[PDB]
Design a protein around this nucleic acid. Structure first.
Lengths: 93, 80, 170, 95, 103, 107, 95, 103, 86, 150
DNA sequence: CTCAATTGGTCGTAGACAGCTCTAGCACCGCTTAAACGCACGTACGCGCTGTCCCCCGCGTTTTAACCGCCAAGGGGATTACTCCCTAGTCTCCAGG
DNA sequence: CCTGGAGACTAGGGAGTAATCCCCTTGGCGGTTAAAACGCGGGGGACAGCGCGTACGTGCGTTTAAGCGGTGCTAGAGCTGTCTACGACCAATTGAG
């Protein structure tokens, strides 16, 4: 099948919805922030500013993996291509 | 549940459809967290340093724009 | 003020044994940096100190002893960071006088050599870190059996990608 | 001050810092002199830029520890504090 | 002549570090005394980290001439050093990454 | 009352740029009135170009309110501003890509 | 209250003169305000770095024109110089 | 395959030995006389008659070495995942899009 | 006596040099269109340095590119060649 | 002959492997140094053997644990035998095939496992590992001095 | 409202671009000995066909915990005044790039 | 040879961390109907492998330029020390942000 997933791409490419969580996403950052230095504090605009950058970083990372399948005649992404694509930018593994 | 189970399975599928991914493998849901942790650690280690450099104890939104400028992922938000 | 040889850190102050002109070795005293006039003697002294630390070719050692090796005269000065934590020095050095069995081996913070090996104890949750070499002589079996699965290290990321590509090429 | 070849005497004096069984050539000194100069210029540019965002002007001893932690990763940031504290504790009339 | 090198034992000259920091005043600014001393230590450590590797890489040839190809083994051989130096090394030669699929 | 903004004919201030250029200039710079008019004009042109490029796509959807999505398409859509501005627009997404490998039975 | 001067109504003053029948919100203004501040710092740094090695201290008219040619390519910096020359020609002419 | 044999070598020996032959000697594969003629064609576009010293060409020859090998390594690494061994001319545009270059 | 009027310099490019430079990275075999596809990117990569060197020389009130403008032109592209000033 | 893969130093003699074309690794034999005649296949291998060893530092990969390999083999001609593996170690002079006295202990790692007790012999460019139980019985003065290095 | 922009004092010490010393630009056409590039005919592995392991689309059922409104303690933002002991300015000794 | 901090000095104007404006962040309880986890039919992905096209690998033939510098015309940096004119910092008009 391919008719159901066809309109889902246009439904997401036309609206910039908030797909990132707010309450469960802050605990993941707090668990790592409490390990470096105790007695810390955060605000509400910092989480939104981080989510606005992560929403673009995810698409930027997925585009590089999706572009590596057209030349190889493939339609399904693979986790092995991400490690090879990250070595060109400078992040590596 | 634990704090590491924040990112769900449909959350990654709803975000991968914006670029142009047709089929999503099963190992992506377990491999994306390993990269997201390293991506968030670089900002976490910088936020505490920026807070301690200003002799403060609260991470504001103005320091994130300055911390993301040196990492290469510049974003226009609260100043900067 | 001639040729410096001795060098040690006393309470965060690096001393300099300045050799007096026309005196013996028993009259050399510690002269702190407070009133001097030798900008070239400080730069010319460290030019030969780094050559002695790299002259050990794979730690040479004969069979007739007389080959004592050491990293520094004050053990990395006073502001140490490896082995123990919370800087300072060896505040707690008790644990080998009882002789018990370790519970389990957990992880700690990674570093570039000399990791903070945390040793657990039974009943109480007392945390003790060893650093002296005298504890590995009276009971060397406990030091050997302690290192088992502390830091999980698989392999290099570059070597794992070569074997994974052969399962999908053909 | 603002000259291009400000270092010339200290560059040729480096000869006993390596092994005594080898010598530096004429094509290996320019690669080593610029390596430290680039890091020095980067540090000087970061010190004059990280003070305006935090409302500062006087570059004291606390403004240098931030540039080392921001440039070097966390795996090697703790190895420089021991070397930096030795240069501060040795300087008298400053604590 | 006390200056600042007589109160701090370092390999690099302390008086030669504050010569370039006085130009960057940035309106009403001030240059500290311990800033140059703290900045020179990191540079000396970074220089020694490469000078030790350049001496340790050569132990079998005992040549009196340092070759530029042998100096690339310290930057391209360490992952923590290759990622920190974003500049390009002047000269050719890389790492012979021999893979099992090529042979 | 006369000023420097009405003499040269520019909406951007002249004193603000002159005061901001004295911070990045090393030592005591002599930033006069001949170094701010040429600096503010380029900024005004770059600010007006994005607005003019975004206004051409706001009248096709029949909406008078300025949306942040129209600013991202005016930057990522042109081949001249995409190579210069390497940053990402917060809250705008990317451009829709059309390919022939998004159906069933391969192509 | 001595806060930093931000460009908030500066863009609206020019937008109302060309298109008076347009209305902006409070969310799309900070995105456009930060872009100018981020693009001006690079030009300021490029103009300041071109005076330390050239033994200069006075910013002339060539330092501003060099940054536009260095950053923007030849496909877009051709009209910028022509638009900027008119402002200098009309300033030195009369009041 | 020998040197005094009428038959030639098999496609898989000289190509593999050439990779190892350039891992023990430091030489400059980029020429000097034919490479200098291409720079003057672009330098004399819409400008006046300029000159060059004996250091610009030497700097460009060293800068191109750190770029050509870096661009070829990405293509060589990407050609393995495509179940192939020879590089393709259309892969350069796909590899340049991941780094940030336009295509 | 200034410069020679050279024309049609795209035919004098060395062919074995492009094949020899690819053997250092680890490229096994090459195609036939690589020699025609590399020149289409080489000019675009060199124009970003050529257009900057002339501007850097004109900004310093000079007409000959010395050994200092090349470093400033390469630092903008993230190259920064070693062994030329600082 | 394409390249050298196997190289072992047995009985004070360095022998190289003859990589024959059109075959595999099991069809390659051995030849003395005085019988070969290829000066171009010596320096290229010597310049690569040092580079492959200088980059294998900082907690390398693990190996086959819970294995003693040697430790009292047998009697009646313990040499000759067959073949161990296809790596650079395995069939190497570990002191039992030569009978030499140990010099000093080198190597200091910190990975998931026991300590690397790399015992280096006299006049030997290579080294191997020894047991931790028979080290404090023969010459226990070296094991104590090895821990008091840093 | 507040405390930024402005005009036009006034002789401070920046800069434009002539001339001079004596580098190494790049013409003409010298020599040595291995590179440029034509197109033989060996046998690598292109990316089409279509075998067959146990992947994961579409959108059921109804847990777990998305994120909604609106409690009210006392964290520590981002400044404004006081008066500590920082290190500029700029004379003129005898060090150093 | 050269050409600038060094040291004595005591002006200029900032760090430390007290005071106290007027509304955020985080632990907590209650509960709508979002989109959470697990794993059902049967679409058509990935990987293993047989057969044999297109156009590369690998020496020889025949050049006519590749490399070092061979020699010598009259352009090209940087240094020197004249004259020249932009706009430091100052006080205080009267209007933008």
């Amino acid at each position: 099948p391919g008719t159901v997933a066809l309109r889902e791409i246009r439904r997401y490419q036309k609206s910039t919805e908030l797909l990132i969580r707010k309450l469960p996403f802050q605990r993941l950052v707090r668990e790592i922030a409490q390990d470096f230095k105790t007695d810390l504090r955060f605000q509400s605009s910092a989480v939104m500013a981080l989510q606005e950058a992560s929403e673009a970083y995810l698409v930027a990372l997925f585009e590089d993996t999706n572009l590596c399948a057209i030349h190889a005649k493939r339609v399904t992404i693979m986790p092995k291509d991400i490690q090879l694509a990250r070595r060109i930018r400078g992040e590596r593994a | 549940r634990d704090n590491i189970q924040g990112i769900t399975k449909p959350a990654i599928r709803r975000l991968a459809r914006r670029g142009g991914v047709k089929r999503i493998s099963g190992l992506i849901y377990e491999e994306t967290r390993g990269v997201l942790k390293v991506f968030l650690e670089n900002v976490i280690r910088d936020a505490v340093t920026y807070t301690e450099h200003a002799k403060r104890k609260t991470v504001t939104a103005m320091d994130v724009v300055y911390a993301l400028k040196r990492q290469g992922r510049t974003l226009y938000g609260f100043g900067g | 003020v001639e040729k410096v040889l001795d060098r040690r850190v006393v309470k965060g102050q690096v001393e300099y044994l300045l050799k007096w002109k026309g005196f013996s070795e028993e009259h050399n005293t510690w002269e702190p940096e407070k009133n001097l006039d030798c900008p070239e003697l400080i730069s010319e002294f460290m030019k030969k100190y780094k050559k002695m630390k790299e002259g050990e070719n794979n730690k040479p050692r004969e069979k007739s002893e007389s080959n004592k090796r050491k990293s520094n005269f004050s053990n990395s000065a006073d502001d140490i960071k490896s082995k123990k934590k919370r800087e300072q020095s060896n505040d707690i050095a008790r644990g080998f006088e009882r002789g018990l069995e370790p519970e389990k081996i957990i992880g700690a913070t990674d570093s570039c050599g000399d990791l903070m090996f945390l040793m657990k104890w039974k009943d109480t949750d007392e945390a003790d870190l060893v650093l002296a070499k005298e504890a590995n002589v009276k009971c060397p079996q406990i030091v050997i059996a302690f290192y088992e699965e502390r830091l999980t290290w698989h392999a290099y990321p570059e070597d794992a990608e070569n074997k994974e590509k052969e399962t999908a090429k053909s | 001050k603002t000259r291009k070849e400000s270092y010339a005497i200290y560059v040729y004096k480096v000869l006993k810092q390596v092994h005594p069984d080898t010598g530096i050539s004429s094509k290996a000194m320019s690669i080593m002199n610029s390596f430290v100069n680039d890091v020095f210029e980067r540090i000087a540019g970061e010190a004059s830029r990280l003070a305006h965002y935090n409302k500062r002007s006087t570059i004291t001893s606390r403004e240098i520890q931030t540039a080392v932690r921001l440039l070097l990763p966390g795996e090697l940031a703790k190895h420089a504090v021991s070397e930096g504290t030795k240069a501060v504790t040795k300087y008298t009339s400053a604590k | 002549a006390v200056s600042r090198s007589q109160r701090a034992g370092l390999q690099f000259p302390v008086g030669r570090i504050h010569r370039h920091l006085k130009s960057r005043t940035t309106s009403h600014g001030r240059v500290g005394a311990t800033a140059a001393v703290y900045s020179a230590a990191i540079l000396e450590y970074l220089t020694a980290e490469v000078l030790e590797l350049a001496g340790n890489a050569s132990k079998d040839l005992k040549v009196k001439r340092i070759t530029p190809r042998h100096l690339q083994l310290a930057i391209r051989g360490d992952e923590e050093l290759d990622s920190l130096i974003k500049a390009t090394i002047a000269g050719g030669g890389v790492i012979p990454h021999i893979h099992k699929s090529l042979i």
